[PDB]
Write a protein that binds this ligand. Structure first.
Ligand SMILES: Nc1nc2c(ncn2[C@@H]2C[C@@H](CO)N(C(=O)CCP(=O)(O)O)C2)c(=O)[nH]1
Ligand SMILES: Nc1nc2c(ncn2[C@@H]2C[C@@H](CO)N(C(=O)CCP(=O)(O)O)C2)c(=O)[nH]1
Ligand SMILES: Nc1nc2c(ncn2[C@@H]2C[C@@H](CO)N(C(=O)CCP(=O)(O)O)C2)c(=O)[nH]1
Ligand SMILES: Nc1nc2c(ncn2[C@@H]2C[C@@H](CO)N(C(=O)CCP(=O)(O)O)C2)c(=O)[nH]1
Ligand SMILES: [Mg+2]
Ligand SMILES: [Mg+2]
Ligand SMILES: [Mg+2]
Ligand SMILES: [Mg+2]
Lengths: 194, 194, 194, 194
């Protein structure tokens, strides 16, 4: 499934309908995915992953310079599933940045997939170490003409081609205290520029 | 405002996109409002309450029956605002089914407004005990044609005229354990028909 | 079991080890149970309830006087258990203060038991209607020489004979926004005296 | 302060008082720190951190391969604080396994400090790069005569010198789904030695 599809015509939500940090009022255009909807979708992703790969030990890999926050929530949800199974399932968690992967189930966790080049490159590397199974979970997949066409195994949301921030998605180290996925405004785009 | 508006043409969410209890698979048609999204709206709703009624001792009245979950969540967010206020703020809670209110800010918390006759009756009575102020917060407002035209002060979501269950909204004491607000199915109403 | 026993030797927890609202700094002596501990114990209480009341429809009964918060948290953990039972489980919730109890398992939920005379009185009236079973769940049971000897079926915490506030336990409508169970100070009990 | 001190005489909690995954029933002896109590303390630590060094931009370093769970949670609380600060506070989140730090407020986050040889070493490296200041937050400090004497700047819990698992503390990648800090049993010690 392509996940939750936010279409190009869907405007999103007015900033006034949800709680927003006041220091970002002029910095955001609109709210795409409230923090609460991200959690509800992420909980479902954890069940899809466990149903498909969680039978035994997995290696979950967070791609650095990315969405550590989404890796953390997804692993929280996975742990809750394991916490109510009858088996004690071990689990390796590591962080990768672009040897013991061989023979194991590898889940790669990314926060956003824009062009898809990063993930396209990462998989070639991981697959040269020949693992039994390598799957990718991405919170957001952006619909962009700049995309090479890659399709993650597990997709939280499919969003229009807009620059988004909040939850896991910083912008020059700002916006990590924003828990909703919003579209950045030109005022904010230039305010926190580097 | 009318709250978060859910239009008649928006289908909703497919059930496979979120975690729903297995035994309710065939009892639902669509997820309108995931649990996490309810929470986001309710947090802002609480900020709106303290903005209009934070100036006097508030009495929070939960309308029975079947509207208690939203009440607890809303008060949790209100209390979190008072504990950040740097002042000792007293607050009264109470439950009401069809003398302290005198001179206080009275918040009538309702889960669903359909015909609006319930809230119409209650307001007329509550105003008799000459409160400083009477406002109604409602999680859901149904666009039902049988509406006598009453608009509450704080609305979570304005939704189509569909029979909805989940989060706070039960049906013959069923669906309490469902956290999302979903439309019931024909199988749903028949199976659990009292 | 007697529950989680907090002995008279234990001074609880220094106030500065936890987040307590600043306006309550001088109004408290010590923290007995942090909010997080309450929740973890309450989750286990929900299991113990289902283990010996899960065979028949439950009527959950909240005694009006303060236990609403703890009622809500206990019910949420019950609902989580049912969510994962792969069975549609109906449940009634009502409120009681100082008829359809014909023959279902009645669960009376209380925040605190001091002398025990309230529970003794209530159980005498409820058993008159001849329910299948009546059980009592209390968050706190005080170790008090004033006790009439009533011990509930499920106990969260057995504490020393001190006047506690926070979480579900208000004091003349004050301390609602306090999340932890803390001992009130003499300066605090005078400051908010009714 | 040495944090929350768990005495050598303290037995911890009987496993029957809290929700414990069934597959670990025989693998644990006692519970020292329920998950919720960890959170309540970690929330206080986030406030101590921000008051002391959170006025400006901080670099948060998680030490791998330790307790990313604690790192993620301490940072969730930090973000919640910044989210109400009325200022856009930038933050750097990085990981390290044992020049951009120069002139920055550097917080090292560790799950457990046993002998202290890791922090002693880590601090000597970081201090060569001339940060504006470097501080250590550790969830658990073990009271052990194997200790080289290092005491972190922020301590969650000072615990006896026993082998603990749960919450961010794994044993050969097991116990990652256990959310309480419990003492492993000698059975569990050799069951997962792998
Ligand atoms: N906050 C925010 N940052 C964005 C967004 N789009 C792109 N970026 C940046 C730019 C680029 C830098 O390398 N990033 C990647 O993640 C490469 C993944 P690839 O394109 O290879 O799939 C992050 C956005 O919408 N919001
Ligand atoms: N689960 C669920 N129950 C619904 C829905 N609509 C109506 N009810 C029932 C019927 C009616 C009482 O007869 N209720 C009210 O709350 C009166 C509000 P009023 O019409 O006075 O404004 C509850 C729905 O959509 N979902
Ligand atoms: N906040 C707070 N109030 C307390 C505490 N002890 C007693 N009360 C009050 C007084 C008494 C009278 O109504 N209450 C009962 O709940 C009856 C339970 P009974 O004695 O019948 O078993 C509430 C305390 O420690 N903290
Ligand atoms: N699950 C669990 N692992 C423990 C415990 N004590 C020690 N370890 C291991 C052993 C040692 C070696 O790598 N570790 C460190 O973290 C170095 C910190 P140092 O000694 O440099 O201060 C982790 C425990 O109690 N529970
Ligand atoms: Mg990334
Ligand atoms: Mg109602
Ligand atoms: Mg009471
Ligand atoms: Mg470590």
């Amino acid at each position: 499934s392509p996940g939750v599809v936010i279409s190009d015509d869907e405007p999103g939500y007015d900033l006034d309908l949800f709680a927003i940090p006041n220091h970002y009022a002029e910095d955001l255009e609109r709210v795409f995915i409230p923090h609460g909807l991200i959690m509800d979708r992420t909980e479902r992703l954890a069940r899809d992953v466990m149903k498909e790969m969680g039978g035994h030990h997995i290696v979950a890999l967070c791609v650095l310079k990315g969405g550590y926050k989404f890796f953390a929530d997804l692993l929280d949800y996975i742990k809750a599933l394991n916490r109510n199974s009858d088996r004690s399932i071990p689990m390796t968690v590591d962080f990768i940045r672009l040897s013991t992967l061989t023979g194991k189930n590898v889940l790669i966790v990314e926060d956003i997939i824009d062009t898809g080049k990063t993930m396209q490159t990462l998989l070639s590397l991981v697959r040269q170490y020949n693992p039994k199974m390598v799957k990718v979970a991405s919170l957001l997949v952006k619909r962009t003409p700049r995309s090479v066409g890659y399709k993650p195994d597990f997709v939280g949301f499919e969003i229009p081609d807009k620059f988004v921030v909040g939850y896991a998605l910083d912008y020059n180290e700002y916006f990590r205290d924003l828990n909703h996925v919003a579209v950045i405004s030109e005022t904010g785009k230039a305010k926190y520029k580097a």
